[PDB]
Structure 1
Amino acid sequence: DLYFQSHMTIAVTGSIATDHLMRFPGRFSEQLLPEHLHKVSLSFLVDDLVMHRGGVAGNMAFAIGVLGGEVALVGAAGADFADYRDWLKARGVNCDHVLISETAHTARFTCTTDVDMAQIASFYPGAMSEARNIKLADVVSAIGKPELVIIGANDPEAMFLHTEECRKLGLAFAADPSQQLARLSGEEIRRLVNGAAYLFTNDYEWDLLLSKTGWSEADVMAQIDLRVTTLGPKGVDLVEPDGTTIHVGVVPETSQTDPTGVGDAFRAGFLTGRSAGLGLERSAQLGSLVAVLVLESTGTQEWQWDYEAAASRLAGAYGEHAAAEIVAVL
């Protein structure tokens, strides 16, 4: 692809939503009877309901912007998006390539979190379904070739069309299907993975992807450059095709407030570090910090970047060398 380069820009594709977050003051697992998983009938009486900006692409773009990166949000929203746009522009996110639906509502995420941070949610797409009409070729024409396109959870068809466009245009992409692994068939999952510079999942999603694709881990590692699997309280594994695994533990949290968007924040921080020339371990350390700041705040985009508190906390979790390197590049 002989077209001109964007200056260090990440293009973030995926959902743009309003998040309705609720808390269940019990444990989902206690109500989940193995004997009955074939047909659950479950309704959780919640304590709390709060509304926040969301969507995986909105969350990740926000985080890249807060960290000072160049980032373009690519997704479909409803006519209400003008206000969300101002919020994202306040952190330096380029929103020029958001498709604004003429008729449909911005997507709605309705999520219940229990006391163990397990989550069970619905996602009503609305305008998200129009993302299949977005042409990444037009984005590239306007801003240049991105360093990386993130293929986040989106309209299912769009997830594939965007991946195919990256392949034919020679753009590096990150396969980041997260929540849609539940909706996507095995065939639909398998066609998103080949050639990915990164595959991101949490541990549950990794097992789910293997289960639904019928692939072994070796089948996956043969076709990607790096697997990144987050492990809840055990941190993150970064695994290369030759098996070399780098592990990074979490940043100790002060509160476990709301896990929504913690993975999105990790991905944003990690990819920011990678764009900034940091290695795998240093990038995942930075990612782990943004993750914990999202875990300690309600909502996905309700956290702040204070450079000296960040430096101090990185040093406290990983040593002074890591902290110096990381804050230095920001």
Structure 2
Amino acid sequence: TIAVTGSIATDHLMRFPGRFSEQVSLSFLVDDLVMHRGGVAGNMAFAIGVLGGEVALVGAAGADFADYRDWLKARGVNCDHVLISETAHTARFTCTTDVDMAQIASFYPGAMSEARNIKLADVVSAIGKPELVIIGANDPEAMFLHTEECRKLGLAFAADPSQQLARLSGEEIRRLVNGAAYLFTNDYEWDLLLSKTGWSEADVMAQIDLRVTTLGPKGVDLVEPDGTTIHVGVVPETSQTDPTGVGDAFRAGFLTGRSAGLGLERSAQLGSLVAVLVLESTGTQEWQWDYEAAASRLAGAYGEHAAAEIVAVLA
């Protein structure tokens, strides 16, 4: 049972047929506008639920959340512990993506700031101790309070400060990482974390059980504290549609694999499949789970043996 903390949002996603390069008073004429379910925690919970995992969504939203709640419950997500603001609306992410997948976005937190009033102890009282708590991008104070509570209650946690790493200080980042079962970042964020914390590579690896570093088109690295390193290439895409939520999808597939007993490489192969399915769609939760297509693309990228091992835990 995975508890996913982080943002819950509505994503307003637009497509610019040009290149931001070519273009202060910027104006982009866009040819697509769609409104979809979002937030890092909603995205990850959705994917874990669709894949058959046991998952609870823990974050703050507005009263407008009813339909999103029904959507997620239909996919097996426990939404009992979503804090509903008395006054604020669910966060909104507004993003324009150009033909090269570059992005210009604005994020309005809304009810997300109230996540600092959530107590993981209440979740535990309701459903028991989760096997893993994901600490995703969120209200910063909530990110700290949740990490501290995980340590105090003895809950394994994944440090997943993607989008907030630029806003956090070195000390704040250090406080999010120590003792993590997993640290997730992309490659740029990893260099940034090292610069801001003042930690060396070895300093970090001595405080976590596993580093997971995504590399965009180059795939993903899984690095253990003893240096053992697994590199998994991407599942090659047939389209680049919209990059929003691809990292969330990787994490959800990887952690669902781990929850089902798969090893590190197989779990990262599953995560790579979910990631490409999101890259090939516009919303973050608009992809469909087709068991046969999953088995096929996993086999084409990684071999029939790996594919069979993975889908065996998804049927």
TM-score > 0.5 by shorter chain: yes
Alignment partners' CA distance in 2, 1:184 and 1:48: 33
CA offset at residue 42 of structure 1?
Answer: 5.6
Q: Does 1:29 align with 2:21?
A: yes
Q: Flag as ranges the 4+ runs of structure 1 deviating above 6 A.
A: none
Alignment partners' CA distance in 1, 2:62 and 2:146: 20
Alignment partners' CA distance in 2, 1:161 and 1:18: 24
- Percent identity of equivalent pairs: 100
Bigger shift: 216-225 or 83-92?
Answer: 216-225
CA offset at residue 289 of structure 1?
Answer: 0.3
SS in 1 for 2:26: strand
CA offset at residue 27 of structure 1?
Answer: 3.3
Alignment partners' CA distance in 2, 1:115 and 1:202: 22
CA offset at residue 214 of structure 1?
Answer: 2.4
Bigger shift: 173-182 or 47-56?
Answer: 47-56
Bigger shift: 166-175 or 40-49?
Answer: 40-49
Alignment partners' CA distance in 1, 2:260 and 2:195: 35
CA deviations 1:250-277 (Å, max 9, x no partner) are: 0011110011111111100000000111
SS in 1 for 2:63: coil
CA offset at residue 219 of structure 1?
Answer: 1.9
User: Structure 2: which 5+ residue stretches go unaligned?
Assistant: none
Alignment partners' CA distance in 1, 2:152 and 2:243: 36
SS in 1 for 2:164: helix
| Residue aligning to 1:204 | 188
CA offset at residue 20 of structure 1?
Answer: 1.1
CA offset at residue 207 of structure 1?
Answer: 1.9
Bigger shift: 203-212 or 42-51?
Answer: 42-51
Alignment partners' CA distance in 1, 2:175 and 2:97: 31
Please give the TM-score of this superposition, normalised by the length of structure 2: 0.96
Which of 2, 6, 10 is equivalent to 1:14? 6
Alignment partners' CA distance in 1, 2:261 and 2:191: 31
Distance 1:268 1:46, change over 3 A: same
Alignment partners' CA distance in 1, 2:136 and 2:286: 20
CA offset at residue 306 of structure 1?
Answer: 1.1
SS in 2 for 1:308: helix
Alignment partners' CA distance in 2, 1:62 and 1:173: 19
Alignment partners' CA distance in 1, 2:124 and 2:20: 44
SS in 1 for 2:308: helix
SS in 1 for 2:176: coil
CA offset at residue 45 of structure 1?
Answer: 4.4
Alignment partners' CA distance in 2, 1:118 and 1:210: 25
| Residue aligning to 2:127 | 143
CA offset at residue 110 of structure 1?
Answer: 1.1
Distance 1:217 1:157, change over 3 A: same
Please give the TM-score of this superposition, normalised by the length of structure 1: 0.92
CA offset at residue 208 of structure 1?
Answer: 2.1
Bigger shift: 111-120 or 215-224?
Answer: 111-120
CA offset at residue 115 of structure 1?
Answer: 2.1
CA offset at residue 28 of structure 1?
Answer: 3.8
CA offset at residue 211 of structure 1?
Answer: 2.5
Alignment partners' CA distance in 1, 2:95 and 2:223: 31
Bigger shift: 81-90 or 212-221?
Answer: 212-221
